[PDB]
Design a protein around this ligand. Sequence first.
Ligand SMILES: *[C@@H]1O[C@H](CO)[C@@H](O)[C@H](O)[C@H]1NC(C)=O
Ligand SMILES: *[C@@H]1O[C@H](CO)[C@@H](O)[C@H](O)[C@H]1NC(C)=O
Ligand SMILES: *[C@@H]1O[C@H](CO)[C@@H](O)[C@H](O)[C@H]1NC(C)=O
Ligand SMILES: *[C@@H]1O[C@H](CO)[C@@H](O)[C@H](O)[C@H]1NC(C)=O
Ligand SMILES: *[C@@H]1O[C@H](CO)[C@@H](O)[C@H](O)[C@H]1NC(C)=O
Ligand SMILES: *[C@@H]1O[C@H](CO)[C@@H](O)[C@H](O)[C@H]1NC(C)=O
Lengths: 96, 96, 96, 96, 96, 96
Amino acid sequence: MDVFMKGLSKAKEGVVAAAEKTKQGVAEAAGKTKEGVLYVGSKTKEGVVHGVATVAEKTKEQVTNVGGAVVTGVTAVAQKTVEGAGSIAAATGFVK
Amino acid sequence: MDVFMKGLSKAKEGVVAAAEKTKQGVAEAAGKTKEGVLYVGSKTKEGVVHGVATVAEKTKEQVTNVGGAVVTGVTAVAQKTVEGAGSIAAATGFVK
Amino acid sequence: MDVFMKGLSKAKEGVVAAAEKTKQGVAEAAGKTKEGVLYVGSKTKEGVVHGVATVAEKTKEQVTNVGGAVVTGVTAVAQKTVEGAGSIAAATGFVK
Amino acid sequence: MDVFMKGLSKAKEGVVAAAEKTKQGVAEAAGKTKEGVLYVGSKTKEGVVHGVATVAEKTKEQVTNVGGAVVTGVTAVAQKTVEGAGSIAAATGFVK
Amino acid sequence: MDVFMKGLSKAKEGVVAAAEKTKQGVAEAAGKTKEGVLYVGSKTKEGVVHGVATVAEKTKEQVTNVGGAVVTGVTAVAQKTVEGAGSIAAATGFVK
Amino acid sequence: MDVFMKGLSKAKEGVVAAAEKTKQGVAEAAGKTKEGVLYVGSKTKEGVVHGVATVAEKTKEQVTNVGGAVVTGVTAVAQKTVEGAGSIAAATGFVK
Ligand SMILES: *[C@@H]1O[C@H](CO)[C@@H](O)[C@H](O)[C@H]1NC(C)=O
Ligand SMILES: *[C@@H]1O[C@H](CO)[C@@H](O)[C@H](O)[C@H]1NC(C)=O
Ligand SMILES: *[C@@H]1O[C@H](CO)[C@@H](O)[C@H](O)[C@H]1NC(C)=O
Ligand SMILES: *[C@@H]1O[C@H](CO)[C@@H](O)[C@H](O)[C@H]1NC(C)=O
Ligand SMILES: *[C@@H]1O[C@H](CO)[C@@H](O)[C@H](O)[C@H]1NC(C)=O
Ligand SMILES: *[C@@H]1O[C@H](CO)[C@@H](O)[C@H](O)[C@H]1NC(C)=O
């Protein structure tokens, strides 16, 4: 009995790394439990409406680089070691 | 019995790293439990409406670099070690 | 019985690192428990409306660098070690 | 040699009647005459851009009439007579 | 040699009647004459940009009439007579 | 040689009637004459930018009439007669 959007339950030694560049309209998390209930002579209505995110959106990204090195975007790195060596490189630029 | 958006439950030795550049309209977290209830002769209405995020949004990013190195964006790094060595590099620029 | 937006429950030795550049319309956290209740001859209405974030937003970022190194954005780093050495570098610029 | 948007030229005994409920983006009137001109070694650019009128427009008109007579809209009437009689009726409501 | 938006030229005995409920973004009137000109070694740029009128406009008109007569809108009437009789009625309501 | 927005030129016995309920962003009237000019080694830029009228405008008109007669809007009437009779009625309400 549990509901998650991005989580974890009943875990040992957890390592989590995350990153987002998102535009979410509705990220609603709902747990609806309905037990032991009676409806003699009744009208019931439940709803979730218009989960729109964006309209008429204009986005422009221009990158002009001459003899250089730039980093743009989203990056996530996670690493665990009991013993040893971990050599990890992401989005690196070496210029000579 | 629990609801999460981005969390964790019943965990030992947890390491979490996160980062966002988001534009969320509605991030509502709801737990609706309904037990032991009667509705003789009644009208019930429940709703969540218009979870819009943005309209008519204009975003522009211009990067002009000459002989350099710049860092833009979102980055998250998490690392755990019992014993040993961890060499991790992200979004690095070496120029000579 | 609990609801979280970004939190954690019943954990030992927790390390959390986070950072945001967000524009959230509604980040409401709601726990609605309804037990032992009667509605003979009644009208009930519950709602959450118009969770809009932004309209007509204009954002511009211009970066012009000549022979340099600048850092822009959101970065989060978390690291835990029992014994050993951790060498972590993020968004670094070396120029000679 | 002349340019008009809604006008008249070299006329005798003119009668004009007009009415609008318009939403025009660009109603620009341009007369561009280019004579006796030289362009040795040159770059020339001329332009008209983004003549947008409206975005994300919401318009609602509700008319609820019980046993009545209402007038809505745009009406234009023009009449000329040398001799005689002119009987003209527009958008009339007779109730008994 | 002349430019008009809504006018008249070289006319005798003119009668004009007009009425508007407009929302114009740009109603610019331009006369550009370019004669006897030289451009050795030059760059020329001419432009008109972003003639937008409206964004995110919300307009609502509700008319609720019971046993009556109302007049809404734009009306223009023009009439000329040398001799005689002119009977003109517009947007009239007779109730008995 | 002349530019008009709403006017008249070289006319005899003119009758004009007008009325507006407008919201104009830019109603600029420009006459640009360029003759006898030289541009050796030069850069020329001319422009008109951002003729926006309105953003995020909300307008509401509610008319509730019971057994009456009201007049709303814009009306313009013009009439000329050499000899005779002119009977003109606009937006009239007769109740008995
Ligand atoms: C780890 O990675 C680095 C570069 O990030 C590399 O030079 C090295 O050899 C790797 N190994 C160890 C044991 O450091
Ligand atoms: C760790 O990473 C660095 C660079 O970040 C590298 O020079 C080194 O060799 C790696 N290993 C150790 C044991 O330091
Ligand atoms: C740790 O990282 C640094 C650079 O941040 C590196 O020079 C070094 O070798 C790494 N290891 C140790 C044990 O310091
Ligand atoms: C003119 O029109 C009216 C109604 O508008 C009508 O009663 C009449 O007979 C018409 N003729 C004359 C000559 O008035
Ligand atoms: C003119 O119009 C009126 C109503 O507006 C009408 O009663 C009349 O007969 C018409 N003619 C003359 C000559 O008045
Ligand atoms: C003029 O119009 C009126 C009403 O406005 C009408 O009663 C009349 O008969 C018309 N004619 C003359 C000659 O007055």
